[PDB]
Short mmCIF file of C-alpha atoms and ligand atoms in Angstrom, two decimals:
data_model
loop_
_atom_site.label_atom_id
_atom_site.label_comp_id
_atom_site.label_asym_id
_atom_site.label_seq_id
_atom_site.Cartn_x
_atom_site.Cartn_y
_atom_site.Cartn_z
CA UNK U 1 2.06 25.19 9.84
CA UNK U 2 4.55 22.58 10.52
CA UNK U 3 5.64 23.04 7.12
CA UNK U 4 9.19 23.07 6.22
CA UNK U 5 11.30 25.65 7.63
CA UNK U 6 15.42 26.39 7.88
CA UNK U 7 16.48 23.14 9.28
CA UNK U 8 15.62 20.99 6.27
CA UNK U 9 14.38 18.03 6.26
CA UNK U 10 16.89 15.44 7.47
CA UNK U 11 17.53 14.99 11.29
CA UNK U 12 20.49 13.24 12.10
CA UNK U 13 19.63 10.45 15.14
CA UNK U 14 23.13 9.02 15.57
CA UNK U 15 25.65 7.43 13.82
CA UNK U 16 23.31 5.31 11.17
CA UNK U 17 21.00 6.58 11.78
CA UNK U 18 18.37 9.67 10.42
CA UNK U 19 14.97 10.91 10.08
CA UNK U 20 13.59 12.11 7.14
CA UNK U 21 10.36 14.23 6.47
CA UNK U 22 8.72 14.17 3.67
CA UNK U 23 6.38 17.06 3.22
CA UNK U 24 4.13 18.76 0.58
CA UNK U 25 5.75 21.55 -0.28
CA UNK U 26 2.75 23.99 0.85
CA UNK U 27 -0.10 22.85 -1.68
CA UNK U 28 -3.24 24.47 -1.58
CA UNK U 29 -6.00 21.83 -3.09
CA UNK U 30 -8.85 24.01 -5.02
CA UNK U 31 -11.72 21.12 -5.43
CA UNK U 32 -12.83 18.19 -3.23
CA UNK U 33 -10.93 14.84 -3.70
CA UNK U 34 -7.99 16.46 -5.07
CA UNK U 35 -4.63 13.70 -4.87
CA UNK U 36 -1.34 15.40 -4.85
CA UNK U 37 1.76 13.62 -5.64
CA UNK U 38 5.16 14.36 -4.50
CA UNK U 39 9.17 13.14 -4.64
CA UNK U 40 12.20 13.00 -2.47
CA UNK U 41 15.02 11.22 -3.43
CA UNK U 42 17.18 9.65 -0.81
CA UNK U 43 19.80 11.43 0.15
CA UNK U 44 22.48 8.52 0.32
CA UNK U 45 23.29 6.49 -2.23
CA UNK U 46 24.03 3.17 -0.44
CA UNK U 47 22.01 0.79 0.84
CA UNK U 48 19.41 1.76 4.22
CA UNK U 49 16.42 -0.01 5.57
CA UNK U 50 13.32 2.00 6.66
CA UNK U 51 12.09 0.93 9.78
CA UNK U 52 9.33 2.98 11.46
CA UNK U 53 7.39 5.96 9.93
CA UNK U 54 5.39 8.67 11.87
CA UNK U 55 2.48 10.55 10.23
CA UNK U 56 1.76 13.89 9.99
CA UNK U 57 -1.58 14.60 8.65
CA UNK U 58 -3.74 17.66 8.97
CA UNK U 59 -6.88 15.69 10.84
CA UNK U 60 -8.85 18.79 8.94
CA UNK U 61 -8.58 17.78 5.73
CA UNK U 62 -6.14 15.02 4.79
CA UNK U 63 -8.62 11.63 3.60
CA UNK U 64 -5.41 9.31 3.04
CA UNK U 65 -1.89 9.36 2.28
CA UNK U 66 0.61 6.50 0.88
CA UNK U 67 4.18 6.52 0.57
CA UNK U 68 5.68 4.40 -2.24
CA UNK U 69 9.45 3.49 -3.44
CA UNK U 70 10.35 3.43 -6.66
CA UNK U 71 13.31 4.78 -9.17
CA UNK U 72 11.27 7.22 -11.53
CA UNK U 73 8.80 9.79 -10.56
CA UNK U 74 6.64 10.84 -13.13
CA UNK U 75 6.87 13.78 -12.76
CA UNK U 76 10.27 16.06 -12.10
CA UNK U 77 8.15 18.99 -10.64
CA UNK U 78 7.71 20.34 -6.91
CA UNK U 79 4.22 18.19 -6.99
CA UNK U 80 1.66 16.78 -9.23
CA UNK U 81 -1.91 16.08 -9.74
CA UNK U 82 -1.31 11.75 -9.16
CA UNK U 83 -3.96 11.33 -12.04
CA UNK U 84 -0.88 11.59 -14.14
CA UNK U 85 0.98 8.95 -12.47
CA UNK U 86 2.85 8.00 -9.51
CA UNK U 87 6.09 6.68 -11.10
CA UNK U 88 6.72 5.45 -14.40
CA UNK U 89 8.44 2.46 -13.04
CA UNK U 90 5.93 0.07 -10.88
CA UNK U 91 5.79 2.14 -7.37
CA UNK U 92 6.42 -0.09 -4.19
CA UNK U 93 3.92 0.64 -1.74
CA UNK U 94 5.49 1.15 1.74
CA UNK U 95 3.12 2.72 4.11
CA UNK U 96 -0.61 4.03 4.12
CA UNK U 97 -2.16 6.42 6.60
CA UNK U 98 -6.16 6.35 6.51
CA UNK U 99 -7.94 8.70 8.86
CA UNK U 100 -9.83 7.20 11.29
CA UNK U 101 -7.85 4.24 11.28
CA UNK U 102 -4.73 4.04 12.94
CA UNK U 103 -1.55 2.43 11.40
CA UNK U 104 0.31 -0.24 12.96
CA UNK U 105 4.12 -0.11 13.89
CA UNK U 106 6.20 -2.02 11.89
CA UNK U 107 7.53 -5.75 14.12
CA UNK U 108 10.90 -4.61 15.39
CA UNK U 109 14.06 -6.28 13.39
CA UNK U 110 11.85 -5.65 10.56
CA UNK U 111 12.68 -3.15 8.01
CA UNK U 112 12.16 -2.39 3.86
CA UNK U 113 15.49 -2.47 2.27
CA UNK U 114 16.08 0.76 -0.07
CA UNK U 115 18.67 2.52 -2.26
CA UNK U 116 21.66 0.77 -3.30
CA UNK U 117 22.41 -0.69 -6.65
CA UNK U 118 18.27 -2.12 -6.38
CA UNK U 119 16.29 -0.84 -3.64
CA UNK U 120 14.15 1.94 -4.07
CA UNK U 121 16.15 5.96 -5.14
CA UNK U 122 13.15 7.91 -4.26
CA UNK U 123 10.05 8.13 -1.97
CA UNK U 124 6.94 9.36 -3.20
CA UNK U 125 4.14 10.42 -1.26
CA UNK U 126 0.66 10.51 -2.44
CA UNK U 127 -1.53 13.07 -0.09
CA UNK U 128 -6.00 13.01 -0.77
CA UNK U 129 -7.46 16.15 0.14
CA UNK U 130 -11.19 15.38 0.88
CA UNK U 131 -12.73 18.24 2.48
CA UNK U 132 -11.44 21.32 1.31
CA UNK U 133 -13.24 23.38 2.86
CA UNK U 134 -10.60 24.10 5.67
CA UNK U 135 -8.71 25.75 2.38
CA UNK U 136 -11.02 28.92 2.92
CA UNK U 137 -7.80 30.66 4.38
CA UNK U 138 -5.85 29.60 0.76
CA UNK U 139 -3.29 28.52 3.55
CA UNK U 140 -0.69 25.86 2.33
CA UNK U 141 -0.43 22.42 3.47
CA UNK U 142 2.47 20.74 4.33
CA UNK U 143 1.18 17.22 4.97
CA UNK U 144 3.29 14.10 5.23
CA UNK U 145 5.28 10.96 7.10
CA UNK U 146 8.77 10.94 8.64
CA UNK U 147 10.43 7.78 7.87
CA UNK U 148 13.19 6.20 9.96
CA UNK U 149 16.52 5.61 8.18
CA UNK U 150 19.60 3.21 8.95
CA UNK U 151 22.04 1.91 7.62
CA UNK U 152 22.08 -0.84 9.89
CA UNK U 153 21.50 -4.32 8.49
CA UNK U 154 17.80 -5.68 9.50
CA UNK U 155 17.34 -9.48 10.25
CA UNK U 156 14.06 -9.50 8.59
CA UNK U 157 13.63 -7.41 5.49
CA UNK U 158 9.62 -6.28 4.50
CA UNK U 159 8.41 -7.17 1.71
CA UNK U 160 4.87 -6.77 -0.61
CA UNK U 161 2.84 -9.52 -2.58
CA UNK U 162 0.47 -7.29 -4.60
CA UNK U 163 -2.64 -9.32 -5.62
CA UNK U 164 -4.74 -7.57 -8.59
CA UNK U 165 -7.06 -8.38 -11.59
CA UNK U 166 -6.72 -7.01 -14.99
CA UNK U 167 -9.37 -8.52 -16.88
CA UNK U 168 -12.86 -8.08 -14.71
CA UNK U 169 -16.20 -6.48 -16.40
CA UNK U 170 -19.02 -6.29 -14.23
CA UNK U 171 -21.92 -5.58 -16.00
CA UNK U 172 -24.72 -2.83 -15.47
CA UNK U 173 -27.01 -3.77 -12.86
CA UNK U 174 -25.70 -7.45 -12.34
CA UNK U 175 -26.01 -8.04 -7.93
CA UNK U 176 -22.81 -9.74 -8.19
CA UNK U 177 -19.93 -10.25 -10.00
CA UNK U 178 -16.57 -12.11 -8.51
CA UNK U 179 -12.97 -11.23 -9.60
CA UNK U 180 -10.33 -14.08 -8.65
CA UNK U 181 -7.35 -13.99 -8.76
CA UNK U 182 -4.25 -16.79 -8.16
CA UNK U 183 -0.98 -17.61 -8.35
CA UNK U 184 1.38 -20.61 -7.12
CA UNK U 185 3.93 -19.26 -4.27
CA UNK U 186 7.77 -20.28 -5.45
CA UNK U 187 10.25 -18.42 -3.16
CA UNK U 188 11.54 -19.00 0.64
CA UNK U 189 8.72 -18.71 3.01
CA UNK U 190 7.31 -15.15 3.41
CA UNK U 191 5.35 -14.32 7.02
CA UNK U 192 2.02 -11.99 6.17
CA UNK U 193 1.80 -9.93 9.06
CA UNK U 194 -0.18 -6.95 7.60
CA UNK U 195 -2.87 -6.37 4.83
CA UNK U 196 -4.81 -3.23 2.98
CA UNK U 197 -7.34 -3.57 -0.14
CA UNK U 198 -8.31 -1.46 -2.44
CA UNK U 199 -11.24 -0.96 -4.76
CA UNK U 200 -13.31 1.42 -5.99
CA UNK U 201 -17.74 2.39 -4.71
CA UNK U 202 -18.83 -0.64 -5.94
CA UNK U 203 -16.70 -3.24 -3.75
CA UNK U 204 -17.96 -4.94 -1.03
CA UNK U 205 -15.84 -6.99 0.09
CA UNK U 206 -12.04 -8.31 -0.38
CA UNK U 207 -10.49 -11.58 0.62
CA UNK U 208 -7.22 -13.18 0.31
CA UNK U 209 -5.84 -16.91 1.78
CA UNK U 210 -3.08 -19.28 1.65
CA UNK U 211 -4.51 -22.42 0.24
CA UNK U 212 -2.40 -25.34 1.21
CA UNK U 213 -3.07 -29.54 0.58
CA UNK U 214 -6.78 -28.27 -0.26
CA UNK U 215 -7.12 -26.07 3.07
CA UNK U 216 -8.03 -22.52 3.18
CA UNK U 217 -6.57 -20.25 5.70
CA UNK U 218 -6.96 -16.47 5.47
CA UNK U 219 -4.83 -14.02 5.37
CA UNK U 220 -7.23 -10.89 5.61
CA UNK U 221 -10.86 -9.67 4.67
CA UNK U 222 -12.14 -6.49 4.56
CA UNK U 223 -14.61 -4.34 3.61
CA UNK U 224 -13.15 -1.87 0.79
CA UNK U 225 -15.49 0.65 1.57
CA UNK U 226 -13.85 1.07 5.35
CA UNK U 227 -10.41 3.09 5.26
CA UNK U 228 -7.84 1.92 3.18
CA UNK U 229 -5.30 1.25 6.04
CA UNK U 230 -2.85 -2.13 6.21
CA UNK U 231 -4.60 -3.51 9.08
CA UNK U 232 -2.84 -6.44 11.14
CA UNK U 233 -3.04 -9.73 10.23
CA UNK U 234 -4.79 -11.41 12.74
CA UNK U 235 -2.83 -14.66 13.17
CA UNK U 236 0.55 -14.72 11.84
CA UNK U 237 0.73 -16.65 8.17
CA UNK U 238 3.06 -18.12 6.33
CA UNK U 239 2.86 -19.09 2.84
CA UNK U 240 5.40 -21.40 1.55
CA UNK U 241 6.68 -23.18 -1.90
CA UNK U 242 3.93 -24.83 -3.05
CA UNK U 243 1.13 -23.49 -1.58
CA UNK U 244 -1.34 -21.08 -3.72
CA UNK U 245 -2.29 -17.89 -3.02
CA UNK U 246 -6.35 -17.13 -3.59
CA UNK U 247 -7.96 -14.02 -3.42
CA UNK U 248 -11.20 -12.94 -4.11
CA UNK U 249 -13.29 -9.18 -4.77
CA UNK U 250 -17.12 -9.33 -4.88
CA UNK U 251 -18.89 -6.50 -6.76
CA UNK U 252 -21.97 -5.36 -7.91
CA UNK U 253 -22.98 -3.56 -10.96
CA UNK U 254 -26.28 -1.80 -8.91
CA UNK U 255 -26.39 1.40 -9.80
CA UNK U 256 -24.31 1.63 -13.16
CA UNK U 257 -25.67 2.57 -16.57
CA UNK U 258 -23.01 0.60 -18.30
CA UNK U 259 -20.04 -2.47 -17.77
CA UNK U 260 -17.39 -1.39 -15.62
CA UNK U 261 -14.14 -2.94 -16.21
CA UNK U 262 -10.74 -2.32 -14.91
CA UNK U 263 -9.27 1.54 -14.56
CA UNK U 264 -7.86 4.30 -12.70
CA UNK U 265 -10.88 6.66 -12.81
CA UNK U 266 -13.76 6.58 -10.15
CA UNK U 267 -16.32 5.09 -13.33
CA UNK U 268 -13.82 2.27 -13.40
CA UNK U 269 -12.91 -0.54 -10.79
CA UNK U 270 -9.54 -1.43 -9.65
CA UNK U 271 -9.52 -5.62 -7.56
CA UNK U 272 -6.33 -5.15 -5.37
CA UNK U 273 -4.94 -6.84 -2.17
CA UNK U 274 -1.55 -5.74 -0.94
CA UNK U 275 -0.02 -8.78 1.22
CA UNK U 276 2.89 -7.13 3.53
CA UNK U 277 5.35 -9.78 4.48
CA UNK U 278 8.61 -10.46 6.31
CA UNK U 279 11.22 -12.35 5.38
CA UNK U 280 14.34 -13.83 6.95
CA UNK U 281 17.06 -11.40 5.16
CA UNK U 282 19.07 -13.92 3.37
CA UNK U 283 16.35 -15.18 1.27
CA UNK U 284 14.88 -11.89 0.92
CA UNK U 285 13.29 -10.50 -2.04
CA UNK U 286 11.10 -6.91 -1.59
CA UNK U 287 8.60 -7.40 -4.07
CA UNK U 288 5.96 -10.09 -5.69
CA UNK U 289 3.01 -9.80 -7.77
CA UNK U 290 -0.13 -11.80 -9.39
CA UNK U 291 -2.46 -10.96 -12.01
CA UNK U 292 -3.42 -13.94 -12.82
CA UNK U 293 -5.73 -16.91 -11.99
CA UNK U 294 -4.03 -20.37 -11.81
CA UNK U 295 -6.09 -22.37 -10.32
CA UNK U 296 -10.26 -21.24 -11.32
CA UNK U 297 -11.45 -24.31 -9.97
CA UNK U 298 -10.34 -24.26 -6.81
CA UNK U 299 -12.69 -21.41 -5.87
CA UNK U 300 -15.64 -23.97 -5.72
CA UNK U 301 -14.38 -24.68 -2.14
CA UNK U 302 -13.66 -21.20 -0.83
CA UNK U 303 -14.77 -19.98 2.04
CA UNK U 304 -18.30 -18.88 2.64
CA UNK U 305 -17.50 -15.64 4.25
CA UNK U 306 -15.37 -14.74 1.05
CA UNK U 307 -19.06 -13.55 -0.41
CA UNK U 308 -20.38 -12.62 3.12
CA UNK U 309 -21.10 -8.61 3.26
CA UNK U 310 -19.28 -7.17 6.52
CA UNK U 311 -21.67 -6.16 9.36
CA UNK U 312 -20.54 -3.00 10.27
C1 LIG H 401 26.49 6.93 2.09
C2 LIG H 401 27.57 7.18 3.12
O1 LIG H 401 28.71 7.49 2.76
N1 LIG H 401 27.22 7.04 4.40
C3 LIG H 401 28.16 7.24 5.50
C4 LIG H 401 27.64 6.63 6.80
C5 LIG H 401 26.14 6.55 6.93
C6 LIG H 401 25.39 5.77 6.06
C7 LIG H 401 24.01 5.66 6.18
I1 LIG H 401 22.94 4.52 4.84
C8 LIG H 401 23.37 6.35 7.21
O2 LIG H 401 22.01 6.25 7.38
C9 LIG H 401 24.11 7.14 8.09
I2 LIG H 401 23.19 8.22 9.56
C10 LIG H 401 25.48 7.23 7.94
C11 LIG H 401 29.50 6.58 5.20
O3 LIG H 401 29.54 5.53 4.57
N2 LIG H 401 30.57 7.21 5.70
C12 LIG H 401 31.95 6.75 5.55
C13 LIG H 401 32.45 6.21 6.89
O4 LIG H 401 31.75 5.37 7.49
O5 LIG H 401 33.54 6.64 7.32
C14 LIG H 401 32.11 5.63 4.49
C15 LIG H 401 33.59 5.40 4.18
O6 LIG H 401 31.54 4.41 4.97
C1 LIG H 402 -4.72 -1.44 -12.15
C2 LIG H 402 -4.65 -1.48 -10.62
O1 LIG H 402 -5.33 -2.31 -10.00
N1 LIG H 402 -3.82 -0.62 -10.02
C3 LIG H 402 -3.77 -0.59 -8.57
C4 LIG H 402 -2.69 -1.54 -8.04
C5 LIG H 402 -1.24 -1.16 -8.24
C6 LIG H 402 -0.47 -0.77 -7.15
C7 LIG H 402 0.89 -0.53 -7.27
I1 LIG H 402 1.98 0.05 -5.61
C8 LIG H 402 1.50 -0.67 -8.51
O2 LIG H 402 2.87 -0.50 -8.59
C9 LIG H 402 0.74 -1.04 -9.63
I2 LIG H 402 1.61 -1.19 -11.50
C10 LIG H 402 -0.63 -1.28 -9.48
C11 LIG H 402 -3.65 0.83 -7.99
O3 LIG H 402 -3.31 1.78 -8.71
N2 LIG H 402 -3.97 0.94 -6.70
C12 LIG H 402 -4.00 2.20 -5.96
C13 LIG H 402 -4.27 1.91 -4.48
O4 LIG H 402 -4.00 0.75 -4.06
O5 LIG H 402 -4.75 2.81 -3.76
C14 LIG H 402 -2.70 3.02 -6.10
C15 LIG H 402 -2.88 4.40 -5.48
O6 LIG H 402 -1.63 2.35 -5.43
C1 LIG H 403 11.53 10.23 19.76
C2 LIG H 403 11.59 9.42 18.48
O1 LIG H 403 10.80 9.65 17.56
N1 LIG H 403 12.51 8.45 18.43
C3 LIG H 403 12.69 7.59 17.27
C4 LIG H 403 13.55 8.30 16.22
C5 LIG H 403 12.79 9.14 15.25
C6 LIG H 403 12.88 10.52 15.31
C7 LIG H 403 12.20 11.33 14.43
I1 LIG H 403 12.44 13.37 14.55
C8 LIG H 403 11.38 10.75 13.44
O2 LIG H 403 10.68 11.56 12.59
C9 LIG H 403 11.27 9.34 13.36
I2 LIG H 403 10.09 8.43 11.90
C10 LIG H 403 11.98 8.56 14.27
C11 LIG H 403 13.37 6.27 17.60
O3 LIG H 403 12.74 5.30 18.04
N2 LIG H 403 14.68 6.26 17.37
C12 LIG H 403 15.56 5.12 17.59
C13 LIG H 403 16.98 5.67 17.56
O4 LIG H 403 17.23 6.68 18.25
O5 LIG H 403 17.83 5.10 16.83
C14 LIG H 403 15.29 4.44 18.96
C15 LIG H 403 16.13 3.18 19.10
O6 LIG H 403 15.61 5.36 20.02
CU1 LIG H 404 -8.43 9.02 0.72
CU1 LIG H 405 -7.94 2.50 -7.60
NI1 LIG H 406 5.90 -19.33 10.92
#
C-alpha cells in the first residue's frame, strides 16, 4: 500500500517549488535485520535546497531509515542489499527516521543545498527491516520520506560535521575502553542545532563538545543503544575558529571472545557522532569531517558524565 502508483513521484507545489517521494520500489525483506538500499536522482539539474522531509514508514516493520546525498550510488539497480555499499563516493547524511523516536523539523530559513555543479545528484535511502514477520503475506513494501524541494535561495544552508574513529581495538573482556576523537575547527562559525550517534551492541555511551579557552560545553550525549534519531540540541552551540571539537565513545569488550576493532559488520564497532549545523549561506560549506585526535591530552579534563552510563 501507499506504494507508487500512476502519478509518479514528483508533486508540483508551486512555482519553485516540489515534493518528491522516495519509495522502495515494493521490496519484500526474507530474514530479520535485512537493510535495503535505494536511488533517485534529482530530477533538475540546477541548484535546490531541501527543506523539510515527511516520513513514511510502515510502523509494522520498518526499524530505521536514512536518507543520504551523494553523486554515485553503488549500485545502478532498482535496490540493493546496503552491505554492499551506500555510494562509492562519501554519502552525506541528510535525515534519519528511528521508530519510536520522533524526528525534529528542520529551523525554518534553513535548508541543505543540493544538485548543481557540487551539491548532491542523487538521494539514497537506506530502509532496516527488523521484524519481518509482517512479510507473512510476501506483500511489498514501499517505505520511504518525501523531501521538500525549492529552488529558492535559503539564508541558512545545513550542514554535517561527521566525528568518527578509525583506529580503536577494544579488547576481549576489557570493562572499558575509550575512543577519542579531535580536531581544531577552521571555517566561519557553524550553529549545532541537532545531533545522532552511532555505534554498534557494545556502546554505551557517546559524547561530543566544543572545547573553547580550556572550557567544555556539550554539544550532545547519548546513549547509542536508544534509537538512532538526530535528536535536538539542547542549547543552541556554536563552534568557532579556534575552538576544538572533542568527542568521546566508551565501550566495553564484556562479552567478546576476541578484539573488536573498527568495521561495518555487527562483530565489528563503528565510534561516530554526526554534528548537524547551520550556517549563514555566504560562508557556507555542506560538509566537514574528523578522524583524528589533535589534542589527546586535553581529555584529562573532560567532563565526568562523558563516562557516566545513561539512566534510562
Ligand atoms: C532546472 C530548471 O530549468 N528549472 C526551471 C524552474 C524550476 C527550478 C527548480 I530547482 C524548481 O524546484 C522548480 I518547482 C522550478 C527553470 O529554470 N525554468 C526556466 C524559467 O524559469 O523560465 C529557466 C529559464 O530558468
Ligand atoms: C567506518 C565508520 O565509522 N562508518 C560510519 C560513518 C560514516 C558515515 C558516512 I554519511 C560516511 O559518508 C562515511 I565514509 C562514514 C557509518 O557507516 N555509519 C553508519 C551510520 O551512521 O548508521 C552509516 C549507515 O551511515
Ligand atoms: C500540506 C503540506 O505537506 N505542505 C507542505 C508541502 C509538502 C507537500 C508534500 I505532498 C510533501 O510530501 C512535502 I515533504 C511537503 C508545505 O509546507 N509546503 C510549503 C509550500 O507550499 O511551499 C508551505 C509554505 O505551504
Ligand atoms: Cu534500524
Ligand atoms: Cu555502523
Ligand atoms: Ni550564536
Amino acid at each position: 500500500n501507499e506504494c507508487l502508483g500512476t502519478i509518479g513521484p514528483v508533486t508540483p507545489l508551486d512555482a519553485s517549488d516540489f515534493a518528491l517521494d522516495i519509495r522502495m520500489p515494493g521490496v519484500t525483506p526474507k530474514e530479520s535485520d535485512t537493510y535495503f538500499c535505494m536511488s533517485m536522482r534529482l530530477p533538475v539539474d540546477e541548484e535546490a535546497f531541501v527543506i523539510d522531509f515527511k516520513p513514511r514508514a510502515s510502523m509494522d516493520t520498518v526499524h530505521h531509515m536514512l536518507l543520504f546525498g551523494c553523486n554515485m550510488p553503488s549500485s545502478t539497480g532498482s535496490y540493493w542489499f546496503c552491505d554492499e555499499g551506500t555510494c562509492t563516493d562519501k554519502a552525506n547524511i541528510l535525515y534519519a527516521w528511528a521508530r519510536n523516536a520522533p524526528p525534529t523539523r528542520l529551523p525554518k530559513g534553513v535548508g541543505f543545498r543540493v544538485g548543481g555543479e557540487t551539491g548532491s545528484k542523487y538521494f539514497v535511502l537506506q530502509v532496516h527491516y527488523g521484524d519481518i514477520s509482517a512479510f507473512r503475506d510476501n506483500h511489498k513494501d514501499c517505505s520511504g520520506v518525501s523531501v521538500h524541494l525549492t529552488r529558492v535561495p535559503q539564508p541558512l544552508i545545513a550542514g554535517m560535521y561527521l566525528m568518527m574513529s578509525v583506529d580503536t581495538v577494544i579488547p576481549p573482556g576489557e570493562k572499558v575502553v575509550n575512543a577519542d576523537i579531535s580536531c581544531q575547527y577552521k571555517m566561519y562559525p557553524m550553529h549545532v542545532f541537532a545531533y545522532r550517534v552511532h555505534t554498534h551492541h557494545l556502546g554505551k555511551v557517546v559524547s561530543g563538545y566544543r572545547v573553547r579557552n580550556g572550557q567544555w560545553t556539550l554539544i550532545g550525549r547519548q546513549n547509542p543503544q536508544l534509537p538512532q534519531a538526530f535528536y535536538p540540541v539542547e542549547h543552541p552551540v556554536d563552534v568557532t575558529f579556534g575552538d576544538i571539537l572533542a568527542a568521546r565513545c566508551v565501550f566495553t569488550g564484556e562479552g567478546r571472545t576476541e578484539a573488536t576493532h573498527i568495521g561495518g559488520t555487527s562483530s565489528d564497532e563503528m565510534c561516530n557522532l554526526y554534528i548537524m549545523y547551520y550556517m549563514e549561506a555566504k560562508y557556507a560549506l555542506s560538509f566537514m569531517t574528523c578522524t583524528k585526535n589533535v589534542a589527546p591530552d586535553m581529555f584529562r579534563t573532560i567532563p565526568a558524565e562523558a563516562n557516566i552510563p545513561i539512566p534510562v
